[PDB]
Amino acid sequence: RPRLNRLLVLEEAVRVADGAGGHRLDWQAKGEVWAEVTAGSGSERAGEFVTLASVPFTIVVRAAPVGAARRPRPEQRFREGARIFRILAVAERDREGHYLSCFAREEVVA
Amino acid sequence: RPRLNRLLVLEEAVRVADGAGGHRLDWQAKGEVWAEVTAGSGSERAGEFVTLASVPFTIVVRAAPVGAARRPRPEQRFREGARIFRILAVAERDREGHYLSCFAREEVVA
Amino acid sequence: RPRLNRLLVLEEAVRVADGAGGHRLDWQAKGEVWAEVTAGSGSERAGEFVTLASVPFTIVVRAAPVGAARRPRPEQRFREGARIFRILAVAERDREGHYLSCFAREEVVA
Amino acid sequence: RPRLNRLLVLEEAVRVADGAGGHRLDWQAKGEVWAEVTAGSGSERAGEFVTLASVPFTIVVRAAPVGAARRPRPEQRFREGARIFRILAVAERDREGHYLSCFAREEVVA
Amino acid sequence: RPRLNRLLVLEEAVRVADGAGGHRLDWQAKGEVWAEVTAGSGSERAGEFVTLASVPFTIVVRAAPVGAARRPRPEQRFREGARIFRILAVAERDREGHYLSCFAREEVVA
Amino acid sequence: RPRLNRLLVLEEAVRVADGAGGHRLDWQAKGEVWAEVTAGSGSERAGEFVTLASVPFTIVVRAAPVGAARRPRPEQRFREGARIFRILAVAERDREGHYLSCFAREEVVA
Amino acid sequence: SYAVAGALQAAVYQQLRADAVLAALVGTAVYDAVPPGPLAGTYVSLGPEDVADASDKTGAGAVHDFVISVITDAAGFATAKAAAAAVSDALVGADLVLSRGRLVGLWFLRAKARRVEKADMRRIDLVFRARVEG
Amino acid sequence: SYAVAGALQAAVYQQLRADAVLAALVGTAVYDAVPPGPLAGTYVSLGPEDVADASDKTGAGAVHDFVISVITDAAGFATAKAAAAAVSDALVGADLVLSRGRLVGLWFLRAKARRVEKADMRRIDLVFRARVEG
Amino acid sequence: SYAVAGALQAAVYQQLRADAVLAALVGTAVYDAVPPGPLAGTYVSLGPEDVADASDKTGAGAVHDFVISVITDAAGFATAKAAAAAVSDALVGADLVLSRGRLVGLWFLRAKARRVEKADMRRIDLVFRARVEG
Amino acid sequence: SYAVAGALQAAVYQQLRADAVLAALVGTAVYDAVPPGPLAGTYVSLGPEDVADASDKTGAGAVHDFVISVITDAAGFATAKAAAAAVSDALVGADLVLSRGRLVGLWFLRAKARRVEKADMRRIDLVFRARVEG
Amino acid sequence: SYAVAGALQAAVYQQLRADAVLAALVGTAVYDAVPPGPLAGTYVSLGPEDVADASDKTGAGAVHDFVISVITDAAGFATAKAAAAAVSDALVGADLVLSRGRLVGLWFLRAKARRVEKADMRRIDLVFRARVEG
Amino acid sequence: SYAVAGALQAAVYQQLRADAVLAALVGTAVYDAVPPGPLAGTYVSLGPEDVADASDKTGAGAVHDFVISVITDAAGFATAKAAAAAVSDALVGADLVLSRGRLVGLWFLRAKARRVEKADMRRIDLVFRARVEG
């Protein structure tokens, strides 16, 4: 069972809609979770005009019902200091349902 | 052998045909199954204009003859609350034929 | 060694040639084999205009010389009731030559 | 170490050159080898206008110096009755150099 | 736990900006780290007009906080003599956080 | 640790430059190494107009400093009789640094 | 697509499945959405149009170049020709009735015919020009 | 893109979600940025324009060929036609108000309609020509 | 494709396998659907046409640009030329008999020749223009 | 590229990061080479030109069709429009100073706008024609 | 392809391997089918033509645009130029003898030259127009 | 390619590595075949031409559209411009000496400039038209 050791400031953006239909994100902070962060095989990835450096980072937190504040939705991102971990998906790692796998990137521009 | 713990409301859509040849789906509920849901490696996937977040979710239920109500056909989808699991295929997991692997997505827009 | 438990009605089509060079298939039945059907990882596959649901289904039967009726050629298909298993290839699974791996699809339209 | 059980009629084509630069193959027979034939994962493959059924078939024979008749060059093909095994490459399977891996197809039109 | 045996001269380039917006790199040396260098499966890769020979080279050093000189950022490269190891990403290999996986190339023109 | 059994005549080409900027290769012989040659999964590969037969052939020799004659640079090729092994990359297989993995092709035209 | 395209696919679906030929040659397997089941395998499909915006100052119309594909699991595709021949016999110079506006001419355009996948299935597209008037 | 493109997508988003039809046929699911949640599945999307730089010595303008796609999870895409028909009924000859300059004519162009992925989702692009004057 | 395409592929298959040359140069290996077995390897194939809709007010016709490919397992493809030469000697100016309508001219068009796969098999397409009259 | 291209990208970078708008709308994130760090995410990029060689007997010049892309991590890309509007307000009819030769007209060309990857990032290219005289 | 194509590749293979230059510059390595062995590595290859059907009422001919590629394992491809120069010196205005009909002019067309794979091998295609008369 | 192409790449390589600029801006890193070693990283490359066969009844010539690429490992590619500017300053209106025939005009054509891979390396092609006379 996972050994949780990092403090990840979970962050959810409020979506202020603009006139054209596109929302504007704020990334106001949410309450902090505890998690383990297990790396994957990382390599740099061609962005737009940026040679973005990415690593897979399966993050494991504890669980909650889907209508609770403690669930990381894939809308949200983690942030440890200045290292933003995006959330690709959340997937309910444990069999009994105690732990959630998340999926991250840590795309540093490099 | 699989330990079944989730309650999945199986759902089958009746196909009201329109004038052009395309059926209109309703997704009326069917009776509930018990299942285990084992996650796969998940990552977000480029939809149409949506950055859809998908995870593989091999779902295992019990079996039935093919002309029975209890078989999940790949027409149908599961739904646990508001988390719709589509069915990709059903594949008869067990050797003796007691259990069926299903294959899901859980495409949340994110 | 494989435990054979399913009854698969082997089917071979006679090829009535049309005027243009294309044969017309009939899929008259052939004698029934016994086989095991081991599933693979299945997912739905983009057909023509159909979202076909496929699973790999390595089918194992007993063997025969190549000029015998009991060999499934890859011309032929299996059929268990209304579930047609196409044959991709036959590959002589056993070392001593007692068993043949087949390779199937079960493309249900879904 | 491999258990050799099949008799494969090795075949080498003499190359009668035509006027345009292209050789014409004959596939005259060569002496017979003993080999094991281990199948791979097979599936049908899109040919030209033929839905060719192929399986990998790593064939293992004994070895010889490269200027000897007993070496299967990748020019040559095997043939067991009417089942022609092409040779993709030969690769010297054993550490001491007693056995050669070959690589086959068995492309039946199907 | 990794056995560190190579001396890698870590190098960071100062970015003298030119008039057009592009920085000019210098690759001034930084202090030397100790590391292990574990090779991956290497093969030559098509460059621009160069047939560049690359190998994966997961390099493992010790860790530091992200605002410290001892962290290899993916901006930087290693250099052992005249063998420059680029840095693809840094990924915090250890569970307790003592060791960092790096990811290299060693693209020799060949 | 690797058991070295083959004698591979290492070959380095001197680069006589022509008038247009392209060097002309000679492939003069260099001193002979001892090596093991471990095959990979081989299959024929589409060349230019040649159906080239290739196999991976990870070759392992002993090591040297990079400015020594005994290092196979990826410029060079091996040759055992008339079987030329190109060198894709050299990668320092051993942890202590005694052995070098090379990477070959053996592209016979076939 | 344009405003008539809601009614155009509806009416060309209704002229299909009413021709006597292609009812004894395909059956009930003429659709846009595939009825899930066993996939009969000698169907046609009528969905992908595109518009070429032929309009006016006063009023507007459309040129719907809709594609009706013919898919066939038979070994040869001489079976797929006569089913596609019964498509083209049913639609060129149709003069049918629409729910939004009307069409003025349902002509014929390019009709390619090839093997889609593994050379097991055969697709015969049939592009028909539908100049409709809104 | 050009200077008017900040105000053009804003105003064609405001003429959408104000038509009575496509409000009873799509709902509130007209957007550029997707609201994350359950993905309702019969939305439209209004983002990808491109400019064809029709300008002047004295002043300058733009030809915005913006694409409004219609995506629909229904089995057939006769549902997606009438939603796209309500797009085209809302936009050709619009004569709306911009924040930077004005447009002079919002015409209609090509509008293809196909299956994007696995043949489960159906995309109906609708290219509209927007000759704006800066 | 068009209504004549059911009878056109049937009649050009019948003029093939009746020429004396290409019967001593290919054999019985002229087909659309491949007879499964050992795959002889010096066959031809006659399936992919496309139509260029040359029609009338009164009546309608078609321009079938059908492709007859020549596939050959031989080391060089000088063998595949004379088999393709016996195709073209058999079909240009054919004046054959159809079951639906008639053709008026079976001309010749582009005929590319290349290696399809791994440079082991050689495909010689032969596009023939078939202006048929329905 | 041509001899002026060393000085052209330098001068259009200097007219950028001096406009007051796009300095309060992007910031200091106008570059060719990306400053590594946290990747702010609402930058522009000015690198890919191409030349259309408009020259003379006596002297020679160039038509630099340089692309300035606008990339934006925001949910919608109405934010990316006004940043691209401030690009185009800064560059059409620029009349700037070069180090090798001079330019005679910095016009405007096509400016497409789309989602590059996973539909998270939005690229607005802006092609500007730069007829320079060497 | 056309009827002359059986004899055309045969005769342009015979004019090759008879020129004194390219026999001291390539050797015996001029072929269509590759002789298996060690793959010498500075060969040429003469297979892919295509036809442009220039014909008549009375009689018919062909425009064979055949490609002769030059492949070279040398580090630079100045070696591959003079071998390709000896191709073009041997074939433009050839006036050779065919077995089916005759050719009237063997001209020269486009001849691209690039690196095929991993930048180790260099392919110089040489398209020659062969207007033959059947 | 054509007969002059053996001498053309040789002479444009000799006019390069003799210009004083691009010798203090690239160095000795002008080549076709790459000298293996450490890969310096601000080189140019002169190999891929293609011919446009401009010839005569009496005599024949060629239009070599040869590409000289500029590759640069620097963070921005303002460094790669002045190296490419020193290419174009060295070659347009060259009037050099060939070994087979002569050239009559070495003009300038399109010169694109982009990021090849991972956006770490920058390729500036420079197409030059070389009308040579054999």
PDB file of N, CA and C in Angstrom, chain D residues 13-78:
ATOM      1  N   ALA D  13      16.872 -20.970 -55.542  1.00  0.00           N
ATOM      2  CA  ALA D  13      16.558 -20.670 -56.929  1.00  0.00           C
ATOM      3  C   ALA D  13      17.807 -20.254 -57.682  1.00  0.00           C
ATOM      4  N   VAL D  14      18.027 -20.862 -58.837  1.00  0.00           N
ATOM      5  CA  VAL D  14      19.033 -20.372 -59.769  1.00  0.00           C
ATOM      6  C   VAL D  14      18.476 -19.164 -60.507  1.00  0.00           C
ATOM      7  N   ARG D  15      19.337 -18.194 -60.778  1.00  0.00           N
ATOM      8  CA  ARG D  15      18.907 -16.891 -61.266  1.00  0.00           C
ATOM      9  C   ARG D  15      19.285 -16.764 -62.737  1.00  0.00           C
ATOM     10  N   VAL D  16      18.388 -17.216 -63.610  1.00  0.00           N
ATOM     11  CA  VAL D  16      18.556 -17.033 -65.047  1.00  0.00           C
ATOM     12  C   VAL D  16      18.208 -15.589 -65.375  1.00  0.00           C
ATOM     13  N   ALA D  17      19.207 -14.808 -65.766  1.00  0.00           N
ATOM     14  CA  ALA D  17      18.990 -13.395 -66.035  1.00  0.00           C
ATOM     15  C   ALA D  17      18.235 -13.209 -67.340  1.00  0.00           C
ATOM     16  N   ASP D  18      17.256 -12.317 -67.325  1.00  0.00           N
ATOM     17  CA  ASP D  18      16.569 -11.961 -68.550  1.00  0.00           C
ATOM     18  C   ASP D  18      17.272 -10.780 -69.200  1.00  0.00           C
ATOM     19  N   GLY D  19      16.710 -10.320 -70.316  1.00  0.00           N
ATOM     20  CA  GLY D  19      17.364  -9.271 -71.073  1.00  0.00           C
ATOM     21  C   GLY D  19      17.297  -7.917 -70.408  1.00  0.00           C
ATOM     22  N   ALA D  20      16.337  -7.721 -69.511  1.00  0.00           N
ATOM     23  CA  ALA D  20      16.111  -6.412 -68.918  1.00  0.00           C
ATOM     24  C   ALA D  20      16.885  -6.191 -67.634  1.00  0.00           C
ATOM     25  N   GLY D  21      17.529  -7.217 -67.115  1.00  0.00           N
ATOM     26  CA  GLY D  21      18.288  -7.122 -65.900  1.00  0.00           C
ATOM     27  C   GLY D  21      17.688  -7.907 -64.769  1.00  0.00           C
ATOM     28  N   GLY D  22      16.440  -8.323 -64.925  1.00  0.00           N
ATOM     29  CA  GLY D  22      15.769  -9.086 -63.910  1.00  0.00           C
ATOM     30  C   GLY D  22      16.028 -10.568 -64.095  1.00  0.00           C
ATOM     31  N   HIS D  23      16.420 -11.214 -63.014  1.00  0.00           N
ATOM     32  CA  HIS D  23      16.637 -12.644 -63.048  1.00  0.00           C
ATOM     33  C   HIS D  23      15.305 -13.372 -62.956  1.00  0.00           C
ATOM     34  N   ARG D  24      15.257 -14.564 -63.534  1.00  0.00           N
ATOM     35  CA  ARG D  24      14.097 -15.434 -63.436  1.00  0.00           C
ATOM     36  C   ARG D  24      14.421 -16.578 -62.493  1.00  0.00           C
ATOM     37  N   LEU D  25      13.573 -16.782 -61.496  1.00  0.00           N
ATOM     38  CA  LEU D  25      13.818 -17.787 -60.477  1.00  0.00           C
ATOM     39  C   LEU D  25      13.194 -19.117 -60.875  1.00  0.00           C
ATOM     40  N   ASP D  26      13.837 -20.202 -60.460  1.00  0.00           N
ATOM     41  CA  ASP D  26      13.377 -21.553 -60.744  1.00  0.00           C
ATOM     42  C   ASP D  26      12.954 -22.318 -59.497  1.00  0.00           C
ATOM     43  N   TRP D  27      13.594 -22.051 -58.356  1.00  0.00           N
ATOM     44  CA  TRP D  27      13.408 -22.746 -57.078  1.00  0.00           C
ATOM     45  C   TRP D  27      13.602 -24.254 -57.213  1.00  0.00           C
ATOM     46  N   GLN D  28      14.752 -24.616 -57.767  1.00  0.00           N
ATOM     47  CA  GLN D  28      15.206 -25.995 -57.732  1.00  0.00           C
ATOM     48  C   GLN D  28      15.489 -26.405 -56.293  1.00  0.00           C
ATOM     49  N   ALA D  29      15.222 -27.662 -55.963  1.00  0.00           N
ATOM     50  CA  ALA D  29      15.393 -28.124 -54.594  1.00  0.00           C
ATOM     51  C   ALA D  29      16.864 -28.285 -54.243  1.00  0.00           C
ATOM     52  N   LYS D  30      17.157 -28.148 -52.964  1.00  0.00           N
ATOM     53  CA  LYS D  30      18.456 -28.379 -52.359  1.00  0.00           C
ATOM     54  C   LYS D  30      18.229 -29.500 -51.340  1.00  0.00           C
ATOM     55  N   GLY D  31      19.282 -29.946 -50.669  1.00  0.00           N
ATOM     56  CA  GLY D  31      19.155 -31.011 -49.700  1.00  0.00           C
ATOM     57  C   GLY D  31      18.347 -30.610 -48.484  1.00  0.00           C
ATOM     58  N   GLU D  32      17.770 -31.617 -47.846  1.00  0.00           N
ATOM     59  CA  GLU D  32      16.810 -31.408 -46.778  1.00  0.00           C
ATOM     60  C   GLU D  32      17.507 -31.221 -45.440  1.00  0.00           C
ATOM     61  N   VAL D  33      16.992 -30.297 -44.643  1.00  0.00           N
ATOM     62  CA  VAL D  33      17.479 -30.060 -43.296  1.00  0.00           C
ATOM     63  C   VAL D  33      16.471 -30.614 -42.308  1.00  0.00           C
ATOM     64  N   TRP D  34      16.906 -30.729 -41.065  1.00  0.00           N
ATOM     65  CA  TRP D  34      16.032 -30.964 -39.931  1.00  0.00           C
ATOM     66  C   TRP D  34      15.969 -29.711 -39.081  1.00  0.00           C
ATOM     67  N   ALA D  35      14.787 -29.428 -38.551  1.00  0.00           N
ATOM     68  CA  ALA D  35      14.569 -28.154 -37.891  1.00  0.00           C
ATOM     69  C   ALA D  35      13.423 -28.258 -36.913  1.00  0.00           C
ATOM     70  N   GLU D  36      13.385 -27.319 -35.980  1.00  0.00           N
ATOM     71  CA  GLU D  36      12.162 -27.080 -35.238  1.00  0.00           C
ATOM     72  C   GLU D  36      11.531 -25.812 -35.771  1.00  0.00           C
ATOM     73  N   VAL D  37      10.211 -25.752 -35.708  1.00  0.00           N
ATOM     74  CA  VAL D  37       9.481 -24.590 -36.172  1.00  0.00           C
ATOM     75  C   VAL D  37       8.629 -24.115 -35.009  1.00  0.00           C
ATOM     76  N   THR D  38       8.990 -22.975 -34.439  1.00  0.00           N
ATOM     77  CA  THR D  38       8.268 -22.381 -33.327  1.00  0.00           C
ATOM     78  C   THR D  38       7.441 -21.216 -33.837  1.00  0.00           C
ATOM     79  N   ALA D  39       6.135 -21.268 -33.612  1.00  0.00           N
ATOM     80  CA  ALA D  39       5.246 -20.249 -34.139  1.00  0.00           C
ATOM     81  C   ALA D  39       5.361 -18.953 -33.357  1.00  0.00           C
ATOM     82  N   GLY D  40       4.961 -17.870 -34.006  1.00  0.00           N
ATOM     83  CA  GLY D  40       4.754 -16.616 -33.320  1.00  0.00           C
ATOM     84  C   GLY D  40       3.298 -16.210 -33.326  1.00  0.00           C
ATOM     85  N   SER D  41       3.010 -15.003 -32.859  1.00  0.00           N
ATOM     86  CA  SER D  41       1.652 -14.478 -32.894  1.00  0.00           C
ATOM     87  C   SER D  41       1.301 -14.102 -34.324  1.00  0.00           C
ATOM     88  N   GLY D  42       0.304 -14.766 -34.885  1.00  0.00           N
ATOM     89  CA  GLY D  42      -0.047 -14.594 -36.276  1.00  0.00           C
ATOM     90  C   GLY D  42      -1.347 -13.836 -36.459  1.00  0.00           C
ATOM     91  N   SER D  43      -1.415 -13.092 -37.556  1.00  0.00           N
ATOM     92  CA  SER D  43      -2.606 -12.355 -37.931  1.00  0.00           C
ATOM     93  C   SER D  43      -2.534 -12.104 -39.421  1.00  0.00           C
ATOM     94  N   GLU D  44      -3.684 -11.869 -40.034  1.00  0.00           N
ATOM     95  CA  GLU D  44      -3.685 -11.655 -41.470  1.00  0.00           C
ATOM     96  C   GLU D  44      -3.236 -10.242 -41.810  1.00  0.00           C
ATOM     97  N   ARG D  45      -2.582 -10.120 -42.960  1.00  0.00           N
ATOM     98  CA  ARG D  45      -1.846  -8.928 -43.340  1.00  0.00           C
ATOM     99  C   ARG D  45      -2.295  -8.512 -44.725  1.00  0.00           C
ATOM    100  N   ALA D  46      -2.422  -7.211 -44.940  1.00  0.00           N
ATOM    101  CA  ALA D  46      -2.940  -6.711 -46.201  1.00  0.00           C
ATOM    102  C   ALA D  46      -1.863  -6.845 -47.259  1.00  0.00           C
ATOM    103  N   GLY D  47      -2.100  -7.685 -48.251  1.00  0.00           N
ATOM    104  CA  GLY D  47      -1.127  -7.805 -49.309  1.00  0.00           C
ATOM    105  C   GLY D  47      -1.303  -6.698 -50.317  1.00  0.00           C
ATOM    106  N   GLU D  48      -1.300  -7.106 -51.589  1.00  0.00           N
ATOM    107  CA  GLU D  48      -1.565  -6.209 -52.743  1.00  0.00           C
ATOM    108  C   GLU D  48      -3.079  -6.063 -52.881  1.00  0.00           C
ATOM    109  N   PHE D  49      -3.727  -7.152 -53.294  1.00  0.00           N
ATOM    110  CA  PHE D  49      -5.176  -7.240 -53.356  1.00  0.00           C
ATOM    111  C   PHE D  49      -5.636  -8.534 -52.712  1.00  0.00           C
ATOM    112  N   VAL D  50      -4.800  -9.065 -51.832  1.00  0.00           N
ATOM    113  CA  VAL D  50      -4.913 -10.396 -51.269  1.00  0.00           C
ATOM    114  C   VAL D  50      -4.863 -10.112 -49.771  1.00  0.00           C
ATOM    115  N   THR D  51      -5.655 -10.836 -48.982  1.00  0.00           N
ATOM    116  CA  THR D  51      -5.662 -10.653 -47.526  1.00  0.00           C
ATOM    117  C   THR D  51      -4.806 -11.800 -46.915  1.00  0.00           C
ATOM    118  N   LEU D  52      -3.494 -11.601 -47.037  1.00  0.00           N
ATOM    119  CA  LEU D  52      -2.521 -12.666 -46.801  1.00  0.00           C
ATOM    120  C   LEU D  52      -2.458 -12.956 -45.309  1.00  0.00           C
ATOM    121  N   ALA D  53      -2.406 -14.239 -44.973  1.00  0.00           N
ATOM    122  CA  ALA D  53      -2.393 -14.704 -43.597  1.00  0.00           C
ATOM    123  C   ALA D  53      -0.975 -15.127 -43.244  1.00  0.00           C
ATOM    124  N   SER D  54      -0.359 -14.448 -42.278  1.00  0.00           N
ATOM    125  CA  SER D  54       1.054 -14.646 -41.972  1.00  0.00           C
ATOM    126  C   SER D  54       1.245 -14.984 -40.497  1.00  0.00           C
ATOM    127  N   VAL D  55       2.291 -15.758 -40.208  1.00  0.00           N
ATOM    128  CA  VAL D  55       2.683 -16.135 -38.848  1.00  0.00           C
ATOM    129  C   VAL D  55       4.205 -16.168 -38.781  1.00  0.00           C
ATOM    130  N   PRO D  56       4.791 -15.745 -37.665  1.00  0.00           N
ATOM    131  CA  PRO D  56       6.243 -15.496 -37.654  1.00  0.00           C
ATOM    132  C   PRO D  56       7.213 -16.670 -37.766  1.00  0.00           C
ATOM    133  N   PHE D  57       6.982 -17.814 -37.110  1.00  0.00           N
ATOM    134  CA  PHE D  57       7.663 -19.089 -37.406  1.00  0.00           C
ATOM    135  C   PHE D  57       9.193 -19.022 -37.347  1.00  0.00           C
ATOM    136  N   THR D  58       9.734 -18.807 -36.152  1.00  0.00           N
ATOM    137  CA  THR D  58      11.187 -18.837 -35.998  1.00  0.00           C
ATOM    138  C   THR D  58      11.668 -20.273 -36.143  1.00  0.00           C
ATOM    139  N   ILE D  59      12.393 -20.557 -37.213  1.00  0.00           N
ATOM    140  CA  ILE D  59      12.833 -21.906 -37.536  1.00  0.00           C
ATOM    141  C   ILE D  59      14.281 -22.033 -37.095  1.00  0.00           C
ATOM    142  N   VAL D  60      14.634 -23.137 -36.441  1.00  0.00           N
ATOM    143  CA  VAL D  60      15.983 -23.339 -35.912  1.00  0.00           C
ATOM    144  C   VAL D  60      16.602 -24.581 -36.534  1.00  0.00           C
ATOM    145  N   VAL D  61      17.717 -24.408 -37.244  1.00  0.00           N
ATOM    146  CA  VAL D  61      18.447 -25.515 -37.856  1.00  0.00           C
ATOM    147  C   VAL D  61      19.844 -25.582 -37.262  1.00  0.00           C
ATOM    148  N   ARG D  62      20.658 -26.535 -37.711  1.00  0.00           N
ATOM    149  CA  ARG D  62      22.052 -26.500 -37.298  1.00  0.00           C
ATOM    150  C   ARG D  62      22.872 -25.632 -38.241  1.00  0.00           C
ATOM    151  N   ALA D  63      24.106 -25.377 -37.839  1.00  0.00           N
ATOM    152  CA  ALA D  63      24.946 -24.361 -38.442  1.00  0.00           C
ATOM    153  C   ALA D  63      26.003 -24.967 -39.354  1.00  0.00           C
ATOM    154  N   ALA D  64      26.715 -24.075 -40.036  1.00  0.00           N
ATOM    155  CA  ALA D  64      27.788 -24.389 -40.967  1.00  0.00           C
ATOM    156  C   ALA D  64      28.580 -23.106 -41.198  1.00  0.00           C
ATOM    157  N   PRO D  65      29.790 -23.189 -41.750  1.00  0.00           N
ATOM    158  CA  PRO D  65      30.442 -21.973 -42.253  1.00  0.00           C
ATOM    159  C   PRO D  65      29.663 -21.354 -43.398  1.00  0.00           C
ATOM    160  N   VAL D  66      29.878 -20.051 -43.598  1.00  0.00           N
ATOM    161  CA  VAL D  66      29.022 -19.285 -44.497  1.00  0.00           C
ATOM    162  C   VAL D  66      29.206 -19.697 -45.946  1.00  0.00           C
ATOM    163  N   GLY D  67      30.359 -20.242 -46.302  1.00  0.00           N
ATOM    164  CA  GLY D  67      30.520 -20.805 -47.620  1.00  0.00           C
ATOM    165  C   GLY D  67      30.283 -22.295 -47.650  1.00  0.00           C
ATOM    166  N   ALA D  68      29.121 -22.736 -47.183  1.00  0.00           N
ATOM    167  CA  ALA D  68      28.770 -24.145 -47.213  1.00  0.00           C
ATOM    168  C   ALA D  68      27.353 -24.280 -47.731  1.00  0.00           C
ATOM    169  N   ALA D  69      27.018 -25.487 -48.178  1.00  0.00           N
ATOM    170  CA  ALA D  69      25.698 -25.700 -48.747  1.00  0.00           C
ATOM    171  C   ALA D  69      24.630 -25.753 -47.671  1.00  0.00           C
ATOM    172  N   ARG D  70      25.006 -26.111 -46.449  1.00  0.00           N
ATOM    173  CA  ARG D  70      24.022 -26.352 -45.408  1.00  0.00           C
ATOM    174  C   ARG D  70      23.496 -25.080 -44.765  1.00  0.00           C
ATOM    175  N   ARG D  71      24.135 -23.939 -44.984  1.00  0.00           N
ATOM    176  CA  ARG D  71      23.612 -22.683 -44.459  1.00  0.00           C
ATOM    177  C   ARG D  71      22.406 -22.240 -45.264  1.00  0.00           C
ATOM    178  N   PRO D  72      21.294 -22.000 -44.639  1.00  0.00           N
ATOM    179  CA  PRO D  72      20.209 -21.284 -45.311  1.00  0.00           C
ATOM    180  C   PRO D  72      20.572 -19.814 -45.447  1.00  0.00           C
ATOM    181  N   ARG D  73      20.830 -19.383 -46.663  1.00  0.00           N
ATOM    182  CA  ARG D  73      20.957 -17.954 -46.869  1.00  0.00           C
ATOM    183  C   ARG D  73      19.556 -17.370 -46.924  1.00  0.00           C
ATOM    184  N   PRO D  74      19.394 -16.067 -46.668  1.00  0.00           N
ATOM    185  CA  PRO D  74      18.065 -15.464 -46.812  1.00  0.00           C
ATOM    186  C   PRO D  74      17.575 -15.315 -48.239  1.00  0.00           C
ATOM    187  N   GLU D  75      18.395 -15.663 -49.231  1.00  0.00           N
ATOM    188  CA  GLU D  75      17.943 -15.889 -50.593  1.00  0.00           C
ATOM    189  C   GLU D  75      16.926 -17.003 -50.681  1.00  0.00           C
ATOM    190  N   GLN D  76      17.097 -18.036 -49.875  1.00  0.00           N
ATOM    191  CA  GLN D  76      16.447 -19.317 -50.045  1.00  0.00           C
ATOM    192  C   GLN D  76      15.126 -19.359 -49.300  1.00  0.00           C
ATOM    193  N   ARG D  77      14.355 -20.409 -49.548  1.00  0.00           N
ATOM    194  CA  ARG D  77      13.155 -20.636 -48.770  1.00  0.00           C
ATOM    195  C   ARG D  77      13.108 -22.096 -48.374  1.00  0.00           C
ATOM    196  N   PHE D  78      12.384 -22.369 -47.301  1.00  0.00           N
ATOM    197  CA  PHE D  78      12.058 -23.733 -46.928  1.00  0.00           C
ATOM    198  C   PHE D  78      10.747 -24.135 -47.573  1.00  0.00           C
TER     199      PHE D  78
END
